[PDB]
Amino acid sequence: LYQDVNCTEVPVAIHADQLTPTWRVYSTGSNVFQTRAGCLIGAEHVNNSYECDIPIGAGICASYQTQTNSPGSASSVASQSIIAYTMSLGAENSVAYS
Amino acid sequence: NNSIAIPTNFTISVTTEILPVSMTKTSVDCTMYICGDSTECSNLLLQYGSFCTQLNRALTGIAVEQDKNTQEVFAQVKQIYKTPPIKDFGGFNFSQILPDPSKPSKRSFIEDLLFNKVTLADAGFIMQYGDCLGDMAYRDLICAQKFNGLTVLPPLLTDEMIAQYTSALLAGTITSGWTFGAGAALQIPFAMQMAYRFNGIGVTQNVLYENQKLIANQFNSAIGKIQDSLSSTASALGKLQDVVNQNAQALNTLVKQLSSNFGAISSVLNDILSRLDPPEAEVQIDRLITGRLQSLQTYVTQQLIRAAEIRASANLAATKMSECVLGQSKRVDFCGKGYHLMSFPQSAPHGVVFLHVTYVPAQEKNFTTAPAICHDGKAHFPREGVFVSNGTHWFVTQRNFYEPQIITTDNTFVSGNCDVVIGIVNNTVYDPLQPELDS
Amino acid sequence: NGLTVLPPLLTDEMIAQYTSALLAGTITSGWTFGAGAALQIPFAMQMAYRFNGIGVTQNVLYENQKLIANQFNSAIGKIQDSLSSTASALGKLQDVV
Amino acid sequence: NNSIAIPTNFTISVTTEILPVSMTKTSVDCTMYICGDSTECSNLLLQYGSFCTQLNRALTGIAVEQDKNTQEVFAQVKQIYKTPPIKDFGGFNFSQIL
Amino acid sequence: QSLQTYVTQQLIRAAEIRASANLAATKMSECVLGQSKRVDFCGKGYHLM
C-alpha cells in the first residue's frame, strides 16, 4: 500500500492516453479501483462488507480469506486471495417498537 | 428541628458536556526532516540509529491507542439498531436530534448547527467545505501543507461511522432502554421508560403519567435551549478547538524550527556545502543534526503528554457512555447536575458530546415534620416518604415530590414505643379493618 | 534569578469559605442542594434516610440517636489522636512540597 | 449451609483522606537564567527561538489547569450557605470542625 | 537541556496533581454532596456521609 499518494508517477509505458475521465479504469465488475487514501497492490475490492480484520484507514480493512470466522473449511490454493473492503459496521437489526 | 422543605413541582433541565476522544494522527520522518537528499547527512544521522526507530514506534503506539479509545467510546454494540418508520413516543420529539432521512448525509441537526456557528466564507460555492476539520473550512488537503513529508494518517474511524454508532445507541436507548447494554435488547415504550427511571431516583412514576405530555414539552423546549446555548455561548466546544489550535501551533513551530541556525554559518545544508568545504563543515552539520534531534525529541515528548491527556479524557467519556447513556447512574454530578434520568450521545470532530437529561425540583414549600407517630403506645415509622403537616392535619408524602395521602397501616409498620422516640407526635392512623367490622 | 512564584488564584480564605458552605449545606440541606435547590431538613432525619440507603432501617437510629451522636463526637476526638500518634497523614502534601 | 452471622451492634468509625489538589506556581525566564545582561549571549539564545516561547506556553497551561482543578474541586456551588446562629442538631456537635 | 528536563518533570508533576484532583472532585461530588454506594471509595465500611 503506497499511502497518501497516487500510483501514477510510477513507470508505465504499456498504455497510451485514451482521454479517460478517471485513470483509464474500464472494469466489468468490482476489479481493483484507485482509492483516495492510498494505492493498494495485491487485493481486489469487493462490494460485500464483513467484520474488520486488518484495519488500514477510512474504514478500509484487509482480509486474506473471503469469509469471516468460518467454523468449517478455511482457504486453499484456489482463486481466493487477499481482499480489501469497507468493514461492516456492526450487525443490522430491527426492533418492533409500539 | 421541626421544619422540612418538600418540592411541589419539578423541571427537566438539559446540559451538554464536550469530551475529547482523539486528535490528528501525525508522523515525522527523520531523513527528509533533517537531511535533504544528501548522502553525507544520512550517513551521519544513521550513527544515532535506534532513536528514529523508537520515535516511530512511539508514534505508532500513540496512533493505535488513539484509535482504540475511539473504538471503545463508540464501538460498544455489535448490533446496529434503527428507529421505527413511525415516530410515536407519547409526546417526545427526537427528530431534531435524530438523523434527517431526507438529507443524503446522516448528520444530526445539532452537528449542522455546530458547524454553521463557526465563521465561514461566502466567496464561491459551498459544496463540501470541510469533511473532517474541527468546524472550519480551509484550503487544499494535507498534500498542500506537506512540503517536508509531514504526513497525516487518516483516522481509522470515519465521521459517518461515528454518527451511525451514535444513532444506533440513541435508538436503542429510546426503544430498548438500558436492556441492550446489559444483554439482548428488550423493546419497551418510551413513556414507560421514564416511569422506571423516576422510581430509580426515588420518585414514584405516578407523577410522570399525570404530567407525561407536559414533561415531553419540558423536554422539547430544553432542546431549543441547546440552540440558544450555541448563540449565547461559543465556548461549549472550547476543548476541541483548543486541542486543535495547540496541535497546529506545535506542528507550525516544528516546521519553522527547520530554518533555525543553531549557531552555524547557514541554516541550509546545500549552502554550507557549496560555500564551505565538506570536511570542515562536518562539525556544523553535526551540530545542526543534534539541534534538530533535540527539537524532535521535545516535540515527541509533548505529543506523548497530549496523547496521555486524550486517553484520560476518552476513558472518562467511555465510562460516562457506559453509565450515563447505556444505563442509569446513581453517582451525583457525574452525568450532569441534578438527578440523572438519561443521556444522549452525539458525534463531534475528534470528540464526543453528551446531553444529560436530568430531574431537578422546580418549586419547594415548607412543612412541619415529626420523627414518627405513636398513637396507642406503638410507634409508626414510614416505610417510604416523610410525614408533613399544614398546621392542622398530618399527612404522608413521598420522598422527592409532594403527594400527601391519608396515613394507613399499609404504608407504615410498628417499631418501638412512644417513649423511645424523641420529638414524636400523636396522631390517628386510618385502619382499613375498622370500617369493615362496623357492618 | 527571577524565579518568580505566581500567587494562586484562589486564596486559603476562599477555600475555607467553600468548605464551610458545603459542610453547612450537608448539615442543613443534605444532598438536595447538590441535585438542585437546597431543601432544609433536620440532621437527625438525614441519617434516617442514609441508613435506609445502606439497607438499615432508620428505626435503630432514633432508638440510639443520642448515643450515635456521642459515637460521632468521640470519633472527632480520635482524629486529634491520629495527629499525635501518626504524623504521616499529610505525607502526600509534604512530599510534593 | 445453615449458619449465618448477624450484627447485634454497630459503631461509627471516621477516617481521613488527604488528596493533593494543586502546587506551587513556578515560572522561569530564559534571558535572566541563561544570560546575565549580555548582548552576545541574548543574540545567541534567540537563535533557538520558539523553544522558550513554547516552554512559557506549557507553564501557563500548567498554571491554568492547576487553577481549574481547584475551581472544580471547591467552587461547585454558586450559592454560599451558612449555619444557623443556634446550633441544635439533636446531639451532634460540629463546633470542633466548624 | 537542564531547563527542558525540569519542564518535563514539571509536566509529570502537573499530570500527577490533576489526576489526584480529579479523584478528589469525584469524591466530593459523590462522598460529600451525595451518598455513594461504591465500596471502599468513600472510606472503609458502608458510607454515611
From Swiss-Prot, chain A:
Changing residue 69 to K: In strain: Omicron/BA.1, Omicron/BA.2, Omicron/BA.2.12.1, Omicron/BA.4, Omicron/BA.5, Omicron/BQ.1.1, Omicron/XBB.1.5, Omicron/EG.5.1. Changing residue 63 to A: No effect on O-glycosylation by host GALNT1. Changing residue 3 to H: In strain: A23.1. Changing residue 71 to H: In strain: Alpha/B.1.1.7, Theta/P.3, Mu/B.1.621, B.1.1.318, A23.1, Omicron/BA.1, Omicron/BA.2, Omicron/BA.2.12.1, Omicron/BA.2.75, Omicron/BA.4, Omicron/BA.5, Omicron/BQ.1.1, Omicron/XBB.1.5, Omicron/EG.5.1. Glycans are attached at residues 6, 47, 66, 68. The cytoplasmic Cys-rich domain is palmitoylated. Palmitoylated spike proteins drive the formation of localized ordered cholesterol and sphingo-lipid-rich lipid nanodomains in the early Golgi, where viral budding occurs. The record marks 75-76 as: Cleavage. It is found in: Virion membrane; Host endoplasmic reticulum-Golgi intermediate compartment membrane; Host cell membrane. Changing residue 45 to Y: In strain: Gamma/P.1, 19B/501T, 19B/501Y, Omicron/BA.1, Omicron/BA.2, Omicron/BA.2.12.1, Omicron/BA.2.75, Omicron/BA.4, Omicron/BA.5, Omicron/BQ.1.1, Omicron/XBB.1.5, Omicron/EG.5.1. Residues 71-74 are annotated as: Putative superantigen. Contains sequence and structural motifs very similar to those of a bacterial superantigen and can directly bind and activate T-cell receptors. Activation of a broad T-cell repertoire may be involved in the hyperinflammatory syndrome in acute COVID disease. Belongs to the betacoronaviruses spike protein family. This is Spike glycoprotein. It comes from Severe acute respiratory syndrome coronavirus 2 (2019-nCoV). The chain holds residues 611 to 708 of 1273 of the full protein.
